[PDB]
């Protein structure tokens, strides 16, 4: 896979960032994930875990994998990277998301993923603790 820079609009909730992609905005899910939603519990959490994260890093990259780009609700599909470091795997480690939305087409980093939501399920991490 490759990265490529992009530039942060804003953090949305725990797994959809906005992003100045190729000169122009673009909301993001990101892959293999799914965080509460902000009403929800946890949800606040994840939505703050992700912010902060893009907002303080001073390098954004996308990391397209090697299926489809976009969803039926026009956002794009990556791996985003703060800084060096894979938000989608940082939000399951901490028990912030579930590995899910896993599609054959797009399932490079899910034994990645799946180690994470392992080891946050051990520790008894947030969604995990009961
Ligand atoms: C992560 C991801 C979500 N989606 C779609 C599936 C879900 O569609 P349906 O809702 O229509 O079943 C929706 C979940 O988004 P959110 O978790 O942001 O709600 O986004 C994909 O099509 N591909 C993906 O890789
Ligand atoms: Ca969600």
Do not use: C
Not at 52 to 72: C, L, P, S, W, Y
Not at 86 to 98: C, F, H, I, T
Request: net charge positive.
């Amino acid at each position: 896979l490759h990265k490529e820079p992009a530039t942060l609009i804003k953090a949305i909730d725990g797994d959809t960032v906005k992003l100045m992609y190729k000169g122009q905005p673009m909301t993001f899910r990101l892959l293999l994930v799914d965080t509460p939603e902000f009403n929800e519990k946890y949800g606040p959490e994840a939505s703050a875990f992700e912010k902060k994260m893009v907002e303080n890093a001073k390098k954004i990259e996308v990391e397209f994998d090697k299926g489809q780009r976009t969803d039926k609700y026009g956002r794009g599909l990556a791996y985003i990277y703060a800084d060096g470091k894979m938000v989608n795997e940082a939000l399951v480690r901490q028990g912030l998301a579930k590995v899910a939305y896993v599609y054959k087409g797009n399932n490079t980093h899910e034994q990645l993923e799946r180690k994470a939501e392992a080891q946050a399920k051990k520790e008894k991490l947030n969604i995990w603790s009961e």
